[PDB]
Design brief:
- 2 copies of one chain form a homodimer.
- Chain A is α+β, with helices and mostly antiparallel strands.
- The first copy, chain A, folds into 3 domains: about 160 residues, Nitric Oxide Synthase, Chain A, domain 1 (Alpha-Beta Complex); about 100 residues, Nitric Oxide Synthase,Heme Domain,Chain A domain 2 (Nitric Oxide Synthase,Heme Domain, Chain A, domain 2), CATH 3.90.440; about 90 residues, Bovine Endothelial Nitric Oxide Synthase Heme Domain, Chain: A,domain 3.
- Chain A contains 11 helices and 18 strands.
- In chain A, the strands form 7 sheets. The first copy, chain A, has a 4-stranded mixed β-sheet, sandwiched between helices. The first copy, chain A, has a 3-stranded antiparallel β-sheet with strand order 5-8-9, with helices on one face.
- In chain A, a hairpin with a 6-residue loop joins strand 8 and strand 9.
- Chain A is globular and about 70 Å long.
- The relative contact order of chain A is 0.16.
- Chains A and B meet through strand 1, helix 6 and helix 8 of A and strand 1, helix 6 and helix 8 of B.
- The structure holds protoporphyrin IX containing FE (HEM) (2 copies), ligand KND (2 copies), 5,6,7,8-tetrahydrobiopterin (H4B) (2 copies) and zinc ion (ZN).
- One copy of the ligand Cc1cc(N)nc(CCc2cc(CC[C@H]3COCCN3C)cc(F)c2F)c1 binds next to strand 15 and strand 16 of chain A.
- Chain B: Its main location: membrane.
- Chain B: Belongs to the NOS family.
Amino acid sequence: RFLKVKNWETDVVLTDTLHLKSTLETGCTEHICMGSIMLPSDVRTKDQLFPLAKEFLDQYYSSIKRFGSKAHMDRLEEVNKEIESTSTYQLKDTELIYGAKHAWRNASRCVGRIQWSKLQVFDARDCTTAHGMFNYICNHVKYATNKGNLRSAITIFPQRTDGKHDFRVWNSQLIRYAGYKQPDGSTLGDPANVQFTEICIQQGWKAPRGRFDVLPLLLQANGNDPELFQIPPELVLEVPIRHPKFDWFKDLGLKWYGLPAVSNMLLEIGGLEFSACPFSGWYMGTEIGVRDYCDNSRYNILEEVAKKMDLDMRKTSSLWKDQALVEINIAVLYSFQSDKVTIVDHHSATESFIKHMENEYRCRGGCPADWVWIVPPMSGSITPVFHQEMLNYRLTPSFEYQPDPWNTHVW
Amino acid sequence: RFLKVKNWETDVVLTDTLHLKSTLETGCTEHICMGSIMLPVRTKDQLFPLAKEFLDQYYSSIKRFGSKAHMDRLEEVNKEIESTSTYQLKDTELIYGAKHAWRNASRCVGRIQWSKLQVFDARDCTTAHGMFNYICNHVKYATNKGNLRSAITIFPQRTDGKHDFRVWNSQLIRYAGYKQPDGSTLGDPANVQFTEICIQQGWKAPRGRFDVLPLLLQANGNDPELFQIPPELVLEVPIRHPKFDWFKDLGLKWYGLPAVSNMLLEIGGLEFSACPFSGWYMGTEIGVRDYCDNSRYNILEEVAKKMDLDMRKTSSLWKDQALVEINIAVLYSFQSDKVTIVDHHSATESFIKHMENEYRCRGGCPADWVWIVPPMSGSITPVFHQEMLNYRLTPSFEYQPDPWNTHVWKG
Ligand code: HEM
Ligand code: HEM
Ligand SMILES: Cc1cc(N)nc(CCc2cc(CC[C@H]3COCCN3C)cc(F)c2F)c1
Ligand SMILES: Cc1cc(N)nc(CCc2cc(CC[C@H]3COCCN3C)cc(F)c2F)c1
Ligand SMILES: C[C@H](O)[C@H](O)[C@H]1CNc2nc(N)[nH]c(=O)c2N1
Ligand SMILES: C[C@H](O)[C@H](O)[C@H]1CNc2nc(N)[nH]c(=O)c2N1
Ligand SMILES: [Zn+2]
């Protein structure tokens, strides 16, 4: 009941008590582990909402060393009064900032959480239209990009009410490249976005049908139909990809954007649901070089790179795929570091996370962590997280997945 | 109840019903996932249901469920248990049980081969000298001059837990490790504790960097005894690189036969505490883990030095570069000496085919993603993208405590 995690490279053993505070469910049972399932998982009735608010307020006032205080009980009664009457409640700015930082802090799949306390929270709860959402998002992009000195940020749009007036960003990320099918059968641009790249065209967009076309924003306010907006190109920081040794690398014609900005998740704070909460940080190099470029279902450039290196692609045991993979990821890091755009390699990021884990075990009693997501997609066992046992459990406040809006939108 | 797993690279969806036959527990609950935890006496009372379950499965597989042979065997095992408190497996049952313990091993990527296991019945063995003889014959048979063959040798089952057969070596063939007074280590740092035990038991240590450890063998609960495997039975491979002529000068070699000898085989409630089994290597086991773990031979630096990589900043990916070259060298050396080995691309591709076949013919394939995904180049192998369900079937291989921690010494 008081659990232990061992690092098998260092024998460091930490004891976890934070999991006992867990509230939600994992999808696992004593009979079957679902640890490798990508996604396990209406108006919150008045009965369900108040305990959720109380648990959240309790930890908030605990964290400011005012648990069981004057203002604690007052705020507890005031929110209880507000739920009994309005059937919801509004967070104070301070509570909102705490809830957002702690949603990041509790994100067991995120290797970058050592930075959790430095998040910049933009309160967009006064927003009413998609033009206004576009305005809030442009300011977010510009603030976070910071001319390449990237800064973490989240912008929080108004919370769900009856499920009919949902604020949604239809893009999965604020900045992504278009993808189109070819008349023959191949795919031009990013194959992961083919369905969305169409719903943009199949709703108004005029595509250059290039390979790296920055998609427009599809923004939905108060449950209305979504609207297209182009992010000002001067706000989208992009990096051409060259190699520090191979001058033909430049000729491959590769680029990527500097700002990773997830926009399709649901932020849950004290029972309240924020369906539109785009957040952004900076990249770990393998996200681009390993996954975006080398996934067979994505840009899938391994074959053409290996050919230009003139590797023996006859037999898999020559490890030509692994060799190209390394070079591709050297170039990504080299390109960002040269153009002065923040990026972290998987060695630094995982070493940071071990230090963060030991901070969380020491000052909080644990850190929920999903090994399947934390270990990088290359060179797994030469990073320290590979040898780190991790306990995965769900704390709140949290970021949660939510249905794609086009499947849900009463159009 | 049915359960689905999705391959996110191909969208292939499989349906698991086999998890319904799962008995043992995983360690996970609805509130915590223990998926990354490395490691998460028996009376007549509980033994006959375990025997019945195993014999029902055995007779089902041979299309004889409910037959007179089946009913007679159940009755015969019933009486033998109530009269003698244990029972003996027929040869057919033992072979079936050991193959299925491998087939059920959710952490094993090599299970496509499970039906071709060569089973050696050593249940008539009575002394450590007799154990040495059986293990020598196993090593010679399994090695087969480099054309490796899977094999398991099965010593007598546990009785009262005070007469166990045990192989004290964790693997049949392993290199010694010696802690020096200056704190440094000569040989395999993983084996320092076991090396010390061997020396204390009388082994004259050559004190080199690749000394094959003696066998320490325990029969019938007696004190263990030292034996030296004939060197002509220990097939080894000098490690050279196909492009880097300086790589041979690193002085590296490895043995050809991976043979795990510290696990416990459970069949129908019976416990076989000495059951060495052997296959052939996946290249990464040597090149990634054995050579490049920080806690093992740890040659990343000296390799990256001789390669003259930028070793000042990790973002140069010198560690990942040297890792690939070392793993190319291991595969090249084994193939050149015609010693069986499989690279991680071939092995994971075969496992996906195996897994899909098992879903079709068997209703499931329990699988531990944390262990199946290789320790380098994770996401460019197809298992990274495969959802897996982990559960426990019997017959099974289990961990057991190291015998030096439990043995009662006779003197
Ligand atoms: C600042 C540097 C950051 C780094 C280096 C980083 C790194 C990562 C990486 C590599 C992943 C794996 C995701 C994938 O493979 O697709 C991830 C997941 C995640 N990150 Fe972070 N991240 C950062 C900032 C943030 C911020 C600012 C937030 C929220 C405020 C956040 C929340 C999350 C969440 C919720 C997930 C998992 C979501 C899912 O299940 O898909 N991250 N992060
Ligand atoms: C024939 C080729 C085989 C290959 C390529 C192979 C490969 C592997 C690998 C790479 C692992 C991961 C273990 C580690 O990283 O230390 C593993 C685990 C395992 N293998 Fe296989 N294996 C083979 C044959 C066998 C055989 C013949 C058996 C038993 C009859 C077996 C039983 C197991 C078991 C029980 C585990 C679990 C290890 C543990 O939990 O410590 N394997 N295998
Ligand atoms: C803030 C931030 C920093 C950083 N370094 N990277 C990211 C993007 C990774 C990321 C991705 C996703 C989407 C998950 C889906 C997308 O479809 C492919 C399969 N995948 C399961 C959610 C996140 F919450 C997240 F974080 C975000
Ligand atoms: C039959 C066979 C084929 C093949 N290709 N490889 C092997 C060796 C891998 C292997 C290794 C181990 C050791 C388990 C723990 C011990 O503590 C340190 C960490 N270590 C993981 C057990 C196995 F059961 C096993 F299989 C065996
Ligand atoms: C903590 C973690 O479970 C541990 O490092 C595991 C991870 N996956 C592994 N996978 C394999 N094949 N072998 C291992 O030893 C390990 N070690
Ligand atoms: C099936 C498996 O869960 C899936 O491929 C996961 C594995 N681990 C991952 N890890 C990260 N960081 N990101 C991912 O998208 C995935 N995908
Ligand atoms: Zn689990």
